[PDB]
Amino acid sequence: DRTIASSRLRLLEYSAFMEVQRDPDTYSKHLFVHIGQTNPAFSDPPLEAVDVRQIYDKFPEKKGGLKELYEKGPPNAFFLVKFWADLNSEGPGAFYGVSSQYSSADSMTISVSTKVCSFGKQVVEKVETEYARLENGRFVYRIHRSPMCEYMINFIHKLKHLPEKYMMNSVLENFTILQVVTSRDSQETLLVIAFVFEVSTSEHGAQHHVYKLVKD
Ligand SMILES: C[C@H](NC(=O)N1CCc2c(cccc2-c2ccc(C(F)(F)F)cc2)C1)c1ccccc1
């Protein structure tokens, strides 16, 4: 279906942004990485596969770690997403947030873990609980303007400081984010997304690419 979905849950949209208030009337918002709600086109080809074994070490090993999650399954829930971040956006106290939306055929309470990882070691984990709302023959879950942690704020600023993009990509090669969305009381896994990043060498802006994770 070329979507980031598992039978239990679907990630409709994902956004990481900075917002600034130019004047009291006007606010400017720049998106670092963006995934939008797109309709599946009949024409579209299947998602390519990446052997999960090959990305194990980019994420912590023991627990909350790909190998273990993937053994727990369900293996249809596991995806990989490659962002090309737009790093061309400033002042003190602009707001840094992450805004996402999910859809389901059921109503649950979902818990969203987000581990920022460096060199496969996790530097921080957020945990968010989100509740179901009903629309369109589906239940949706909205996460509005969730704050960015400061690690990531410092990382983005200092990463933008670097003189050349190829350096940025050198730093990014051991930067990952692992996101696991569970049902809160079940702790059943609904959706796991591994995230890897590259700086957009084009001025084309934010791009992404989705691959299914497999264990042949
Ligand atoms: C709730 C909050 N979520 C986050 O902080 N984040 C971080 C930033 C981020 C996220 C998702 C996708 C992409 C990015 C991102 C990464 C890199 C770059 C670039 F351009 F710099 F490479 C640009 C955008 C989610 C959180 C709080 C505490 C602990 C962990 C998480």
Swiss-Prot record:
One of its GO terms (biological process) is positive regulation of transcription by RNA polymerase II. Residues 1-216 are annotated as: Transcriptional activation. One of its GO terms (cellular component) is chromatin. It comes from the Eukaryota. The keyword rRNA-binding does not apply. The keyword Acetylation applies. Keywords: Acetylation, Activator, DNA-binding, Nucleus, Phosphoprotein, Transcription, Transcription regulation. One of its GO terms (molecular function) is DNA-binding transcription factor activity. Preferentially expressed in the placenta. It is found in: Nucleus. Interacts with YAP1 and WWTR1/TAZ. Transcription factor which plays a key role in the Hippo signaling pathway, a pathway involved in organ size control and tumor suppression by restricting proliferation and promoting apoptosis. The core of this pathway is composed of a kinase cascade wherein MST1/MST2, in complex with its regulatory protein SAV1, phosphorylates and activates LATS1/2 in complex with its regulatory protein MOB1, which in turn phosphorylates and inactivates YAP1 oncoprotein and WWTR1/TAZ. This is Transcriptional enhancer factor TEF-5. It comes from Homo sapiens.
